[PDB]
Write a protein that binds this ligand. Structure first.
Ligand SMILES: Nc1ncnc2c1ncn2[C@@H]1O[C@H](COP(=O)(O)OP(=O)(O)O)[C@@H](O)[C@H]1O
Ligand SMILES: Oc1c(F)cc(F)cc1-c1cc[nH]n1
Ligand SMILES: [Cl-]
Ligand SMILES: [Cl-]
Ligand SMILES: [Cl-]
Ligand SMILES: [Mg+2]
Ligand SMILES: [Mg+2]
Length: 265
């Protein structure tokens, strides 16, 4: 159906391990979108064909205001193209670098929108497993949208693929290679809430080996400016035992969240 000749390519929106994303306009309809380009040679070499298929299958059927939409796909003899919803206000990662830290209002609002999207996902037993600032995009009204479902699966699960980059957002059970479920996204939610308020993840470190150690032993401390409400929520989410981590309904109903968020459930 679709082909490259149907689109006019614009400026680069960003780059990933495989994905090179461009702004694009469909010629006949003038529809503005984002074109995620992946090279087949790199996909085969890394052997992550199954990850790409999962990303397409899972994200294309999901329908939620806080989840980035996937419209379709096509390919030539060298590349695979994903037709994505265009997010005009960029990434949370960029916004965080710009402001260094978020206030309590901005943080609680983001967490609320994340919890809503994750609640929708977990209802279909879909785990994201790769929640981090660079995979969180912003809509025209500044609303948060979860993207990059390349690592997403169905619960329960083990890990078949090699961990590539940072360990900063992964729970102990994932890095130790043990079996895991939906509770891993709530660990990441705690890491995110910390980084939003502080400016850096709680287990950040100089080396892979040491970051591993701090995560497995849950070694983190709060700066003095972190309020008691934020500390309570973060401490509940960052539990070593997955079953002790709260439900998403508990997060959405937390007194600190309800007092500072500007969005409802
Ligand atoms: N729909 C989009 N709108 C705007 N920017 C995007 C969009 N999709 C991706 N990007 C940019 O491209 C980067 C990589 O996209 P992503 O799909 O996460 O690639 P990868 O899966 O290789 O990490 C993101 O960090 C973001 O900055
Ligand atoms: O060609 C593809 C496609 F059309 C859809 C999809 F999800 C994946 C692929 C793919 C993965 C490795 N080679 N090709
Ligand atoms: Cl690629
Ligand atoms: Cl498995
Ligand atoms: Cl895997
Ligand atoms: Mg990404
Ligand atoms: Mg990816």
């Amino acid at each position: 159906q679709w082909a490259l000749e149907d689109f006019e390519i614009g400026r680069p929106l960003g780059k990933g391990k495989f994905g090179n994303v461009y702004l694009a306009r469909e010629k006949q309809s003038k529809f503005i979108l984002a074109l995620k380009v992946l090279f087949k040679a790199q996909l085969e070499k890394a052997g992550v064909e199954h990850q790409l298929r999962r990303e397409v299958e899972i994200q294309s059927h999901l329908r939620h205001p806080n989840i980035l939409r996937l419209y379709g796909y096509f390919h030539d003899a060298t590349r695979v193209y994903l037709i994505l919803e265009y997010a005009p206000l960029g990434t949370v990662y960029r916004e965080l670098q710009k402001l260094s830290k978020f206030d309590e209002q901005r943080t609680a609002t983001y967490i609320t929108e994340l919890a809503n999207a994750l609640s929708y996902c977990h209802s279909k037993r879909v785990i994201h497993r790769d929640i981090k600032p660079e995979n969180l995009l912003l809509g025209s009204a500044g609303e948060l949208k979860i993207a990059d479902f390349g690592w997403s699966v169905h619960a329960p699960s083990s890990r078949r693929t090699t961990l590539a980059g940072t360990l900063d957002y992964l729970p102990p059970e994932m890095i130790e290679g043990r079996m895991h479920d939906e509770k891993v996204d709530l660990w990441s939610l705690g890491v995110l809430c910390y980084e939003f308020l502080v400016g850096k993840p709680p287990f950040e470190a100089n080396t892979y080996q040491e970051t591993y150690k701090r995560i497995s032993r849950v070694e983190f401390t709060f700066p003095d400016f972190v309020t008691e409400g934020a500390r309570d929520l973060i401490s509940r989410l960052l539990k070593h035992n997955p079953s002790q981590r709260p439900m998403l309904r508990e997060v959405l109903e937390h007194p600190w969240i309800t007092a500072n968020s500007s969005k409802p459930s």
